[PDB]
């Protein structure tokens, strides 16, 4: 009985990437799940403001100021599930809902792709339910009645895992379905690709790391492969080409 309406998807971006990254996401996966997706940035934008309205959150800035903004906005929302992704992630909402239905409904859950205390790599995307997120507030807000000395020199993703494992006694539940670009993405082809919850694109150890799809867009038209993935998943989309 969990539905898509129970999920708050937060995307982190910055002004310098509005044209280069954000427009691509708005054309592709954000167009299939706009009602649940909120874009956190640091300057206004006429084009994004047009397409998103209040779904464009312009911040004027323990956790970084944008991540604190995402947590605060999620809690205000009241929704059961929080999922964080970066501006170089692709989200499959159908695969996401199927995974989230798999957890017992009254247990704390933190799910993602593990990295070394264990933490979910932020560039792969990760999800937390409301009950666990509400328990994180004292640390996540940098409040004056908990110890955050350890929190101040950790990145956002690490900080999240530390709070959950080290302060709350919880545990990361690993899933093979979340993917960063710190991963050899070429093992994921047309056959595996539809079962995945997130994909990524980017440079790591000197290699442009992308999923393996022959088309329907060329690498020159679609270097991230996100347009091609989108067309595999949603072939009814009018702007999808043949190849
Ligand atoms: K921190």
Swiss-Prot record:
Alphabetical GO biological process terms: blastocyst formation; marginal zone B cell differentiation; pattern specification process; positive regulation of Notch signaling pathway; regulation of Notch signaling pathway
This protein's UniProt keywords: Developmental protein, Disulfide bond, Glycoprotein, Glycosyltransferase, Golgi apparatus, Manganese, Membrane, Metal-binding, Signal-anchor, Transferase, Transmembrane, Transmembrane helix
Cofactor note: Has some activity with cobalt, magnesium and calcium, but not zinc.
Glycosylation sites: 60
pH-dependence annotation: Optimum pH is 5.
Domain of life: Eukaryota
Keyword Transmembrane helix: yes
Catalyzed reactions: 3-O-(alpha-L-fucosyl)-L-threonyl-[EGF-like domain protein] + UDP-N-acetyl-alpha-D-glucosamine = 3-O-(N-acetyl-beta-D-glucosaminyl-(1->3)-alpha-L-fucosyl)-L-threonyl-[EGF-like domain protein] + UDP + H(+); 3-O-(alpha-L-fucosyl)-L-seryl-[EGF-like domain protein] + UDP-N-acetyl-alpha-D-glucosamine = 3-O-(N-acetyl-beta-D-glucosaminyl-(1->3)-alpha-L-fucosyl)-L-seryl-[EGF-like domain protein] + UDP + H(+)
Binding site for Mn(2+): 88, 181
Known function: Glycosyltransferase that initiates the elongation of O-linked fucose residues attached to EGF-like repeats in the extracellular domain of Notch molecules. Modulates NOTCH1 activity by modifying O-fucose residues at specific EGF-like domains resulting in inhibition of NOTCH1 activation by JAG1 and enhancement of NOTCH1 activation by DLL1 via an increase in its binding to DLL1.
Record protein name field: Beta-1,3-N-acetylglucosaminyltransferase manic fringe
Provenance organism: Mus musculus
